[PDB]
From a paper:
Specific membrane proteins, called fusogens, are required to modulate lipid-bilayers and thereby facilitate membrane merging. The founding members of this cell–cell fusion family (FF) are the epithelial fusion failure 1 (EFF-1) and the anchor-cell fusion failure 1 (AFF-1) proteins, both of which are named after their respective knockout phenotypes. Both proteins have been shown to be sufficient to fuse cells in vivo, and induce fusion of insect and mammalian cells in cell culture when expressed ectopically. FF-mediated fusion appears to be bilateral and homotypic, that is, dependent on the presence of FF proteins on both fusing membranes.
The consistency of EFF-1 proteins on the more spherical vesicles allowed tomogram sub-volumes to be averaged to produce a 3D reconstruction of membrane-anchored EFF-1. Our 3D reconstruction reveals that the natively membrane-anchored ectodomain of EFF-1 has an asymmetric elongated shape. It is ~13 nm long and the region most distal to the membrane (‘head’) has a cross-section of ~6 × 4 nm2. The ectodomain of EFF-1 observed in the crystal structure is in the post-fusion trimeric conformation, whereas the native membrane EFF-1 structure determined in this study is monomeric. A protomer from the EFF-1 crystal structure was first fitted as one rigid body into the determined EFF-1 EM reconstruction and gave an overall good fit with a cross correlation coefficient of 0.497. To further improve this fit, the protomer was subjected to four iterations of flexible fitting using Flex-EM25, with each domain considered a rigid body and flexibility allowed only in the hinge regions. Our structure and the fitting unambiguously revealed that domains I and III are distal to the membrane, and that domain II is proximal to the membrane. The flexible fitting of the domains yielded a ~16° rotation around the domain I–II hinge relative to the crystal structure and a ~19° rotation around the domain I–III hinge.
Author numbering: 12 to 34, 38 to 57, 79 to 255, 258 to 370, 375 to 487, 524 to 538
The structure:
Amino acid sequence: RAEPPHCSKTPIVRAQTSQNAMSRGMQMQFSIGLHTAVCFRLYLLHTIRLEKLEHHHPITQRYTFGIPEVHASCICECDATSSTCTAESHQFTACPESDKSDETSSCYRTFFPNQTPIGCSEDDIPKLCCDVRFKPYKNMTFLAVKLEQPTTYATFVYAAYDFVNGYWVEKDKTKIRSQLDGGTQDRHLDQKRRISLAVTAGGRASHQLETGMYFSRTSNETEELRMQPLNEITDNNFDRLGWYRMDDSGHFHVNNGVVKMDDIHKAKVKNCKEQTYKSILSANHYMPGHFNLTRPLEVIKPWIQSARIFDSSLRQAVVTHAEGTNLQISIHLESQNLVFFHNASRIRDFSGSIIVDSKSNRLFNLTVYEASGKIDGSVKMSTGFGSDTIHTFTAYVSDLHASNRSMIIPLPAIVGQGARAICLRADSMADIDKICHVIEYFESPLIKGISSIGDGVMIAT
């Protein structure tokens, strides 16, 4: 089923290599676009596609966490002297092993003395004792990451095709990786080692990464990165995510539960006789009724196509830029001949919206339908088709066969507020075939749960 990608139309600059006190070469220069292909023959058709643009993720931090289901059972002791409900039994301690009860559950004890004698004697000052219980909710698991900090890599796809009796044959197929932050990077591409690919970036890549705490769900296994107030590994804010953390075994616990439990659990006696009390947790991100989540970055951030932990090793996260600037290529060889070829373009329909994202990115979130090759856009003044052109663009769809693709089109500041018309036309298409639509403009800017014990009192009088 071997097939070449749409060979884009690219101007080629002939440069001459400098010389030493020896034996008069030449270099073929061109600017390749992200998600487009370049084709040439050596005088076996050679193709290079700038497939992926990635910023690296690591700096370190990593920790699995969950969402806890909290339940607190208490008991009152009317006589302040009593052996039942004491500082040694309740203050800073986990309720000792039940032997039958769930392994997933995690409990902590808190001591509430100096009570009011309600349903008691006027002189004796009561005391309250509680078991705060925590278990994972819906078995929800997430990795917390201190997230992508850019290093930039380009991923190219080199394929050499041959036309053997009516059909194309993918002879050689490699993945080329080149670091974009330094000077030119050079390597051979073909097995014959005759040709060399030289990649050079103009400056920093189109878009940028924020430094902070991120996370995504785990399926017992990385997913689309989300952003919601989350704790750095060394921090333990109860109003932010990750205070309910998973250790090695898969057991979830409250981060420094023992010690902190008394600062976050607050209970007062309602009536010591009936064994009634007012209870709450001074925290967030717990069940019941204290947990929702932020949508993936992909969804909220137009400049982001995808942001995911790369694999099972959980060492790097890959941020795929919605679109990126072109890269500078030079193809060099001894002394022979190079000819560059190009295919043509087609387009059924399109859809999209003009967006200024939270990180101040002005782009056209374009989606093409049954399209291939070089596609030319024209952003118009007003909603009226035929109004004055304010920007002109060209997108390159790499699929040989007309397919549906989604892309990011950087726009100048002239493409200001309000809805407007945009007209797309493929290459060499008559102005009758030109699709127009009015496109929309969007812009992003920059409690007490009272319960009666239930378990009954074992110590009445």
